[PDB]
Design a binder for these strands. Structure first.
Lengths: 48, 49
RNA sequence: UCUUUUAUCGAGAGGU
């Protein structure tokens, strides 16, 4: 839960995200990427 | 006095360490957000370690 | 009848 990943407010009108948010987002991006390739066109050396 | 005293003018100089810039105390000030503990600092009503 | 805000990471200069 985001009690573990807090989001800081920078110049009051800007706010970044603690690392685990961006990293989970990147893992999920890579998940949606891994889905498509092995569901249709698969050049083998693009899956692994 | 039963003893004589060595006496004379010497050249003294005064540094930049003042007690008015070091005294500190806290009752119940603010906390952080990540752990809800006291904060690190003096100009923020901080707490000692 | 209260309450009432101080980013973050990093670097350096210092005091016992």
């Amino acid at each position: 839960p985001p009690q573990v990943r807090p989001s800081i407010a920078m110049d009051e009108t800007t706010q970044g995200q603690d690392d685990l948010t961006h990293k989970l987002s990147d893992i999920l991006k890579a998940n949606i990427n891994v889905q498509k390739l092995e569901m249709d066109g698969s050049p083998q050396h693009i899956i692994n | 006095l039963m003893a004589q005293v060595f006496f004379g003018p010497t050249y003294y100089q005064r540094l930049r360490h003042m007690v008015d810039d070091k005294i500190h105390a806290r009752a119940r000030g603010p906390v952080q957000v990540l752990t809800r503990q006291p904060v690190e600092g003096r100009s923020r009503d901080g707490g000692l370690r």
